Ligand binder design. Structure first.
Ligand SMILES: CC(C)(COP(=O)(O)OP(=O)(O)OC[C@H]1O[C@@H](n2cnc3c(N)ncnc32)[C@H](O)[C@@H]1OP(=O)(O)O)[C@@H](O)C(=O)NCCC(=O)NCCS
Ligand SMILES: *C(=O)CCCCCCCCCCCCC
Lengths: 8, 393
């Protein structure tokens, strides 16, 4: 599966 | 529990993955080839599920079944590390991702509650020809592994993985490629997501990003402002007549990387021909009428969990971008403008292929989410992100 990233 | 970092992962014992034909996290790999030989007799019976649950292959051509899968993923699929955003793949996107050329119904592997028929688990495989260093192999790509929140920590994911493995083995395929946000034995490459703000006000309000202490909202909005129209001469949406040249451009462009797909012309049509709210591809047709470049990005929103006002984050994801006459920086600048025009809040890209050459210059900020790349039953040396040339949805 893909992964959910947000801004560091 | 799962491990997000190599630090955490060194402390784990992997009761399931130790049983699988993948290298151990500690070892370095100095060879190239299968972990174990191909099997000449395959288990004919499905693996046993816990009591009260049954296998069911999902016909995604039935709109109601597709909507059940939509709902399972919408409520139970991947979240960010802070449980603030969850993927919201659309039904039409799922059809795109799950019925490419060569798709098989038995590789859409669902789990239902026996009494209620509720869909509580899923995993999928699609066929792909994969080039890894000096070898080209028919593999599958595994995607959408999902266990309902209530069914978790009951060892259902290992059963889903073993069952899809069995169903792929029955078709004579013994290698797979897949990604994960967590560290497992054993990544062939590690990528990092980066994010280019397009609607910074919303991104800050929903806490996808934050104001960097010494910047104001007004400064942040001016920082990320974009032109109204793209600048590259001859940029236009991909059309049917462009399928051969997009295939040619992509094939030649990918030779420089070490992990890449090998697409037929029919796969190129599937993965790149524009579909509104799923996949956008724009080509550069020059003054001689030749297509020399193309950019592409797919549409994948996230649910904004537990938020009273903003419910969805509209995200565009960089797909494959091929440059031969237009500089990659200019190409990606135009992708940003197009995504802004289409109403996206953020434009996401990994640090793979040549993306590092433009990420900082185009004002992307690093993310908190890794994307690990894995091969099943294939031993090879790991590679840096710049040599990964494969993007999975
Ligand atoms: C990831 C998910 C499917 C795991 O289901 P689960 O209820 O936690 O199943 P269990 O933890 O009891 O099974 C444990 C095995 O599954 C492995 N596993 C956990 N997450 C995995 C993942 N994303 N991919 C492959 N294997 C995974 C575990 O590493 C463990 O193997 P190990 O003993 O060698 O470490 C489930 O948490 C889920 O649906 N999460 C949201 C969607 C998601 O993250 N999908 C996969 C993205 S890669
Ligand atoms: C994202 O959802 C990926 C989850 C991957 C789970 C592990 C898959 C391991 C490979 C199984 C198929 C092997 C076929 C030879």
């Amino acid at each position: 599966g893909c992964s959910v990233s947000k801004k560091k | 529990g799962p491990a997000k970092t190599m630090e955490e992962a060194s402390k784990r014992s992997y009761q399931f993955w130790d049983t699988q034909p993948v290298p151990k996290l500690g070892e370095v790999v100095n060879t190239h080839g299968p972990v174990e030989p191909d099997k000449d007799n395959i288990r004919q019976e499905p693996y046993t599920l816990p009591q009260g649950f049954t296998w069911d292959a999902l016909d995604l051509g039935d709109r109601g079944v597709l909507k059940e899968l939509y709902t399972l993923l919408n409520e139970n699929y991947v979240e960010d590390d802070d449980n603030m955003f969850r993927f919201d793949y659309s039904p039409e996107f799922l059809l795109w991702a799950l019925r490419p050329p060569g798709w098989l119904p038995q590789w859409h592997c669902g789990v239902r509650v026996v009494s209620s028929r509720k869909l509580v688990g899923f995993i999928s495989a699609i066929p792909a020809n994969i080039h890894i260093y000096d070898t080209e192999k028919k593999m599958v790509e595994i995607n959408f592994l999902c266990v309902h929140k209530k069914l978790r920590s009951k060892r259902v994911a290992p059963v889903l993985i073993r069952e899809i493995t069995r169903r792929v083995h029955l078709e004579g395929i013994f290698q797979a490629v897949y990604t994960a946000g967590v560290v497992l034995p054993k990544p062939v490459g590690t990528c990092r997501y980066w994010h280019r703000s397009l609607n910074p006000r919303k991104l800050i309000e929903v806490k996808f990003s934050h104001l960097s202490r010494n910047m104001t909202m007004q400064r942040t909005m001016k920082l990320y402002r974009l032109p109204e129209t793209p600048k590259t001469a001859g940029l236009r949406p991909m059309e049917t007549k462009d399928i051969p040249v997009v295939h040619q451009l992509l094939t030649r462009y990918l030779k420089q990387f070490h992990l890449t797909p090998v697409m037929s012309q029919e796969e190129v049509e599937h993965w790149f021909y524009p579909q509104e709210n799923i996949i956008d591809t724009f080509v550069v047709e020059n003054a001689n009428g030749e297509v020399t470049d193309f950019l592409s990005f797919y549409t994948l929103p996230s649910t904004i969990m537990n938020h009273p006002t903003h419910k969805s984050l509209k995200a565009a994801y960089s797909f494959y971008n091929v440059h031969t006459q237009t500089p990659l920086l200019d190409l990606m600048s135009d992708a940003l403008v197009l995504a802004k025009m289409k109403g996206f809040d953020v434009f996401n890209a990994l640090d793979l292929m040549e993306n590092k050459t433009f990420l900082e210059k185009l004002k992307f900020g690093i993310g908190d989410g890794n994307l690990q790349y894995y091969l099943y039953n294939w031993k090879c040396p790991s590679m840096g992100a710049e040599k990964v040339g494969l993007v999975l949805q």
